[model samples]
Target chain A: TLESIKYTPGSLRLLDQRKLPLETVFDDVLTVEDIWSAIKEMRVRGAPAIAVSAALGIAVATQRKAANGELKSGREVQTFLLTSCDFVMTSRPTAVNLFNCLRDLKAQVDKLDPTKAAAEVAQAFVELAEAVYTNDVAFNEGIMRHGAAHILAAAKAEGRDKVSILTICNTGALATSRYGTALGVVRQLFYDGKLERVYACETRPWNQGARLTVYECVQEDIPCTLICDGAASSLMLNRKIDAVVVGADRICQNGDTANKIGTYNLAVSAKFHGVKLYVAAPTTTLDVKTASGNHVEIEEREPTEITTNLVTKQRVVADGPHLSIWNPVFDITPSELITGGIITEKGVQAPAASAPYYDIASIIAQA
Target chain B: MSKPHHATLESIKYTPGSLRLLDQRKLPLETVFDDVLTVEDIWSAIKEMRVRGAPAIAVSAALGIAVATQRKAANGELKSGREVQTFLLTSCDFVMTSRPTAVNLFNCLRDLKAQVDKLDPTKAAAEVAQAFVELAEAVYTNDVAFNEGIMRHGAAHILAAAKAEGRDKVSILTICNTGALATSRYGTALGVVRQLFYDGKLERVYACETRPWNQGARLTVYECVQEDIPCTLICDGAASSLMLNRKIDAVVVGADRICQNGDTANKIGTYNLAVSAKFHGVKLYVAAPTTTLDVKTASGNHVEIEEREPTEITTNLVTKQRVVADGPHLSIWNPVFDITPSELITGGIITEKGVQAPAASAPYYDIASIIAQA
Candidate 1:
């Protein structure tokens, strides 16, 4: 079923994640309000997924505009589409792919003549939506093939019967269009019978590892172990782990990546243990405008995510009475700490000064 | 209170721990059971409280024996006291096996064994029962004093060691839940901290949130709150960072087993903190009763560590799911105990007898002499 094009017509139906790890409910997101809420509440997340959803949101809005007879000329329709894209971009502030995808659609719209037909602009936006969805899947597949090949070959060379990989957070279909970034590589390796086991860190506070990652692993029938994020360093030292694989929200041209908090500690320990550190991201995740992670906007999340009462029947705070807790949402990892960048559709970007930015830029240019 | 030269069963009812029956299963449920227990009841109590502090278990065992013998004697069913002494001694041995590693239980058992061996078989069962009650009381009274000695000696060494190293204000870290609740009155590692706090030698106490059960967060925090000890709780990961930045004077923990090589096994995170202490140059000390020592095991590698149910690892039992997920199929890895090697230890081992240096080349302590005197 490796089709070049897949369409959901409107904002792809989102599963109500609030009731998640408890019940699964898939509801269609038809209105502009639905897409906005999904982004704000993290119902539709993953950097690439956000971008794809944003693009589809514009397509749906454009279809609505045409129905209202507002698309008299190409220039008027293009302006409305740009405004719609900007609104979707505001839903979540951090994901760079949203801005990139919007900019590509805007650039394509600007090329249309003001005197041209309304149907022409509508046709262009649809093509852009299809490209975004198709490219992400193709890119994810490429990353899986290339990254899994390198990991399995390295394990075989070391005379290993099988290899163990550890990952943090959720980076799967729930986060992306279909095949995931880092997790896709893991899935590929598992299917090939090369993966001995996969250890998923129970990414704390939000517990992405426990909720989403474990669900993904169980569905895929991947042999998985769940450990609290605090136990990562100890596990690395004690277990026969071969590599640490993770997905990134944004990767700078310099290869620095901004991901979840607690990632830097894992990277530091990986470096100390001589284990390979990998960043599995789609090409759209790469931001050529940013030089490095120091410039990446690290979102300071609400303390409530960490300190407030949890969902354990009754909220129990671990801190003593009258004590407040400090909880930061995300931490950035410097590009220098990463050993390799596995980009879907574009292949691998080795760690070097001459690492290919043209490969990512050219793909974005074509889109 | 002057040290009782000869204690009786009545003295147990007055010990601080006697009033607090921590029905290990019924907590953090506030239902308290205060009924006087028989010798058989004591055996079950010891098994239930096996993981409880050494002094608490000893006191419970002593009180159990006392109550059982007293109740039987009052009922007056064929009362030649010699039979009661023999029966109580056998019950003591039964309770001692509930946890083979606890020295106080064995020590208490030995005392009762000696008292029964000296009594005449022809004596009235009421007389034999009265003698056994006095023996049980002596075990309880002696332990309170023994634990106080352990607390004072251990705390003094920690403060002295810190002062010698030119540290003015000292911050100490402890693992698991050791406190007045765990012991007869003062705890082992907690006893040291309590003494330092009383003496105004400590600055702050950093307690690790000992995971799975979170005994540190639940019980230890309750003790600190009650005592007004300046304390902060840190997740297990923050120990190394805390030590790197803070002037941590020492890391003290109670031991489950102490090997001949001086290697000790406490709670799971104890070893992690020990390694961090070694790297940061913080002194690590283990405060325990002689009962925790297992001379039979050559070293830490030989100790049989218990691996608990994996669910304890992913989601906290009390707090349930902070990480909201689908179902129980979510896998976890939780090991209840971890071993810390002797090489990481620095100068401190407090038993009821005395404090010993980790490097001391003495043979394992024998309790046979203590038994013979009783």
Candidate 2:
């Protein structure tokens, strides 16, 4: 029901996520600049969607080169496609899912037959990039398939026919290519009739839950409750939160996850209240390149995003000195704090150890 | 030498004809003081939440009554002292509706009613005005004096603990607004910060922008900036992270009601901070006046938690954004406060009498003795 990104050859259209749940607006991308701006401005987001959009952007650049005969020589086209791949990867620094996608585009160029002509190699790249987009959507489907079964068994062990879950931010169809990473499990749980209710944190500063997740709940007819970010702990105290499922930007080899800023707070509180914490992500989100969670860079957002009263649309400044504000967009959930399982397309891999650190390398290796 | 930090900004100021108050809502960006001279103006200001201090509410209520009665008597409306007493007594009930949850305004009303009853029916209009002005100023006077005493009492313990550790400055974290905007003068939890800042013993303050309503971001930071106290704002959910990552000596926060065993019923997120503070080995101090100690409530469980209307939050701080869930069968749990156990009150409870360390057993820390003395 929720639409995000559409792609075919030279033209790519993306649903603007910022105007989502309220207004339906599609952005057209004909140039690499259009694709770059789409990703940078967050018109096409979610790790899977961002990766797909970038792949298609590089493909479209190859199409332009073919039409202009700029691809007269094989070497000339390789340089342009390689540079285009580099351009798309720089759009977002956090999502590792995108780096691998763009890297595969450069590798796709290498896969061309040595005997093939310039136009022939360009057509091969166009199909290869399109395959990248469709494969990720398939990966998203596989994520839900695997996550649903794990959550079902966990729910059964708890002696509940219907599983009540808590999640943060908007991990839905809009957040991903289709369905989502963490929300992918929610969709699966609903399909199998194991879902009772979902408690979603309003996701402060940006309110992704209020705008997007709540919208998705209404959009898809899923039973979801919105709560303030501070209310999560109290909610855990009063409500029967069977499990906590969250999306991941990057899952290090050690299984430490980097996610939205308040994810750590939820993890810490989850551990305190004896709730099972789960992270759902596609295998592509796993970055063995990141040796540890500490190596992952956390982006510090603008202070006004937190300090300014956005509802009132005023700064709320006084006579003298101004108030200092700190707002970090993402945070690293230490592997030691991850209690339950790291749900992927393979299966939910509960940590080999009890700490937040999980042995995810072996599980991803099987894929 | 400069006046002590205790003698700083008063959110509620009563001069000759003007009832001056620092509007808290328009804070940090604009510090506009409104001069409320009429009852309707005062009520609208209260209704609008421009002032919003517990102490200011008390002063504002009395001043509201003072101006209303003064006008009536001058216009030859009052024939005798009984008429004045009846007018003042009725106004007490009227001003009570202006705000809810603040016990001080009712306490001020009780004092006003008693003062009004003490007058003879044959008494002059001048005498009636004297009674109103005297008690109105007394409420202001007692509040300022007690707050100064509380700041002095709390800062000493914080200073001594920092000195023992050979630390130069103390870094404190708090929730909600309890400074110039919440009191007659220096605030309860914020009063300690003022004293420490004035003494050059405070390193910095990590203020949690208390959610559902962000008084910390809206008002506390406003007070900190106005006073030149170095402060940083953190989201309410960010409290655990602040305690976990950054440098913090103690968690200094204000309480709405502290039970007999020292279990404090404070802001909605106070319990979360206490849990994190205990886990991090950070001492948590509840800075409050003795009046905040409720002997009627036997334990923390006995303290009533208030749930506000969902329609009130039916809107948010965002402009042109309305959140009304059509489906998904939503229900909101918007309790105004949470109870923190006395055992977690590690640093002790700071009051005007002094900061009392809680004992392991029931009726922790001889709260009865302080109340008995009061």
Candidate 3:
């Protein structure tokens, strides 16, 4: 119901998240330049949504150019599409989804028939671009289905009929092209009539949970409670939280997950409180090539993000020479603490009780 | 040339019939103290958190009763010792309504009531009122002595432990405002850090910018910078990252209540920090005066953790802007404290009496025995 990202065959629109929960405005991204600016300005965010937006930007460009009686030859179309692929990579080269989407787009262009006309080539490219958008939505849907069923079963084993969940950061309709990763699972449980409640942590330094996830939950009429990040451990102890599901930025071969900063704290707390911990993500977040979490470099943000007020840009701490601060954007949760398992589009892959790490490589290879 | 024992700010200013408290609502930016002459003013100050910290709140409430009784005595209103006993007992019930989670206020008022209850009715009303005033002021003076004793014992204990580990300079992580502004002078947990800095054994202090109040940022950091001690400010959720990435020797924090079995109820993030400290193999300690230790409560489960108003989390205290999206479907949970199990308390309990270590085999400290001896 919260239409954050919308896509059609020859049109793409993204909700401007910068002014969310106050005003609703959509940025129409038509050209590659528009796509670059949307991502750079954070008008359109999230890894999967950005990738889908970029692919559709090229499709819209080709459709419009052909309608204007330009780019007449198949060779010209191929040259333009290949060059645009390289250009889109520069927008957010760090996103694994964007790199994979661009690579798949290039491969489609390479296999095109050279004797085909311009309109035919343009139509074929548009179909490929449309498939990218459809696949992403389906990927998220699969994640939601598999994760909800597994979490429900996990709660049933503990002799509970309805399930209560605690989550950190924002993972909802705003974070993906359609149903979000971890939040998508909560949506599924609600639709199944098995959800008791959802507790969202007001992730500090960026408050994505309070601003973004709370908006989507309110829009859908889900019973949700917002709490400070520090209260998660207390909530687990005081309340009957069956499990904790969170989204991940990158997952290693051994199942070590790097997520938003407060995630490791939740994992530690969840393990202590006997609550199951799950990382829900599409396969795009998995970097099975990386051996462990140590190989992933953590992004350190500006000190002002912690010291200055988010809206007013005023100093919260006193200005002095000896004021030191640490602002790591993410922390790694080792595999052992993820008791519930890794919920993905493929299936719920949990480590055996005797094993120390998850066999994520095999799960991906089988898919 | 050690630094002199002086606080950069004063939290409490008290005389016989006049009590002044630093308006903590406008702290780290402005220095203003409000006059609290009657019992009602004391209630408003404590409820509004103009005067905070368990020890400070208890001391202020005790002084408020003394000042109110003194004013009545001067007016020749009190005719007998029995009349003064009735007034003091009624006042204790009124002050306890300001806050529920803190046991110090309840205990302090109980001690004061017991003193007035046993006074002989044959004694003159003026003499009994004078005795009550002295008894109330001792609550203020004793807190100062307890904090000094805590600084000496906690500092000596931590430095010796770090020395045994072959580390000369120690780094500590603390949450919330347990500084001089939060207490009478020096602090309970933060007092140890001050003493260590004076002894020249401190390397750095990592302070969590505690949310909903920003006490660590507004007060602790202000105190650290004023004393010229090296300090790092971090978000409450980032405390684990600090322990994992840095060489943190111990995680020290203050408590609102310490159970007989040594379980502690401190700021909301203290439990989360204790869990991480145990996993990371760093020591965790609860630093408080003997008055904070409640032998009446056997464990943290028996203690009540206060839940504050939703507005504290809904609106930014500094900017006064709504951070969470407002909607009928959304609610909030703003618990002021959390319970840390005694087993996770790897280090001994640092008290004004001394460091009470856990039993050699089981991870339990007999806080009742310690309180009895003290």
Candidate 4:
């Protein structure tokens, strides 16, 4: 319901998530520099949203340039697209989708006719970039459909009509091009009229759920309660939480999922509490080349991100400059703890009875 | 050359009739101590959470009456022994109304008021006031004694656990504010940390930045830094990861109240840590004075957990403004405390009396035996 990432041909508008749930302002990310800034500053975050926004940035910037005859040859257009892809990849790490999306764009540009008119090459790039946004919406919708049904069936097996879910961070429409991945399941369940309640964690250090997810929930008139990240285990202990669904930044071949820093904490707690935990993401999130979670690179943010207050930017810790703060942006949740199946655009990848981890390779093979 | 011990940081500064409390709310930045000379000032400090912890609240409340009584005697405001009796009893009841959860506050005030009832009825007004002042001062002195007893006993038990695991020094994790700032002198749970550091058995200390209040971040870390303890701070959610990745031997935390069955009610995130401690095979202990133990309550279920204001969660720590987006359907669950089931308390209850472990065969603690011994 909250269109966080609004896009059209040659025009991109991002809902300023930093000033969200309070101010309704859209930042025009028109140039390549704007795309890098938006992604770096987290004006447009989420794995899917970051990739989609960057892809569209190339489309719009190249389209405008070609129309003004700034690029007269296909070689120039191809060079511009490839260089833009390389530049956007430097914005942030940890989200494999960004790297994957830019790689696909570069591959598309290389296969093009370099001797043709620049306008035609730009148009072809625009079509491919536009597909990234459109493809994400379809992938998200598929993920929501599969995830919602899986969770509902789980609740129904226990003789329940409605299901309550616990989720961390923001993974709703704001985090994607249209519908969210994990949050899309939430919206789908709500649409099915079987949603009982949503327990959203006020993710520490960032408070994305508090600022963005709750905003989306309120707009859709969904019942949502905010809890601190530390209370996720306590909430599961005390409440009748049917399931826990979270989006992943990167999914390893062994089904180890890398998500927001607290995701592993939730998985460990959920397993101990006997609550089903699911990782919902598009196939783009699954990286088969990566063997396991340990192989994945984890981004270490600044100590200021931990010591300084997120809203006021004032120092919270005494002698913080000299203090040691472990501010890892993401953590890897082992496949064994993700008790529930991994929901993807293709379908749910259930863990094999004979195997310790999910057959993510088979799931990606079908796609 | 010998190692330098922990630096002293006083929470309650009392001498005769004057009392100044370290304003814990503005700590770790500015070390401001406010002079509390009246009963109402003490109540305000407790209610505002400027002076927290079970024992500290009780001691501060008792000291407030001491200062007011001394001032009343010097100013000739108390004309008769009857006036002194009425003033002392009324102030005791009023301070008891400042906080509701901690059983120590009620127990301390009730004990002090009993001393007032037995005072000489024909004594001079100044003499009566001085007797009350001495009675109140004893609460402060006795709290330090209780804290010292728990520290020695607690540290001994922790060392035993570490030695059983074949380690001389151990890495320990704790949450919330449980140091000198929370008590009269040495803190309860944190006092054990102080004792361990003093004994050179402490490898490292990990303090969780208790969310919503940041007590662990603001108070506990400040105490650790002041004492120059080899301590690192972690977010509350990272406790499980720290346990999984690091070689943490035990977790020691303070209790607001410990029920008869050893069920502990502490800061909101304590229960979560207890569960994680059990899952990770790390020993967890609740350290407090015998005064914190209550024989009336059966278990944690009976303890009423306080639900604080949403602004405590919504308000940004640095900006002092709302950070969570506004919405009608969006609600906040800001509970002040949660019950840590006694079974999960693997290291048992550490009190001034001793560490009371559950029966060898069953998950039951004889808290009454410990209290009776006390």
Choose the strongest candidate by TM-score: 4
- TM-score, every prediction: 0.72, 0.89, 0.91, 0.94
Model with the higher TM-score, candidate 1 or 2: 2
lDDT of 3 by residue, A1-367 (tens): 6777777766778888766776788877777788878876667776677777878888888777766778888878888888988887877533466777888799989999866887788889898888877887898999999999999988888899999999988888888878899999999999999998999998887777888888889888888999888888889888899889999877888888888888998998899899989999888778766788878777676788888876467777776786788888788898988999998889898877765468767777756
In model 2, how large is the Cα lDDT of residue B83? 79
Which CAPRI quality tier does the interface of model 1 achieve? incorrect
* Number of the top lDDT candidate: 4
The DockQ assigned to candidate 3 is 0.61
Chain B TM-scores per candidate, in order, are 0.80, 0.88, 0.95, 0.95
TM-score-better candidate, 2 vs 4:
4
Q: For each candidate, give the interface RMSD after superposing the true interface residues on Cα.
A: 4.3, 2.5, 1.2, 1.9
Give me the runs in candidate 3 sitting further than 4 Å from their true place: A8-13, A28-43, A54-95, A103-129, A353-356, B1-4, B72-82, B119-130, B361-363
lDDT of 4 by residue, A240-285 (tens): 9999999999998889898987888888889889999999999988
lDDT of each: 0.68, 0.76, 0.84, 0.85
For model 1, the interface Cα RMSD in angstroms equals 4.3
Lowest lDDT block of 10, candidate 2 chain A = A311-320
| Tens-digit per-residue lDDT, B138-215, candidate 4 | 888888888889999999988997888789998889999888889887888899998999999988889888888899
Task: Provide the lowest-lDDT 10-residue window in model 1 chain A.
Answer: A1-10
Query: What lDDT does model 4 reach?
Result: 0.85
DockQ, every prediction = 0.20, 0.43, 0.61, 0.54
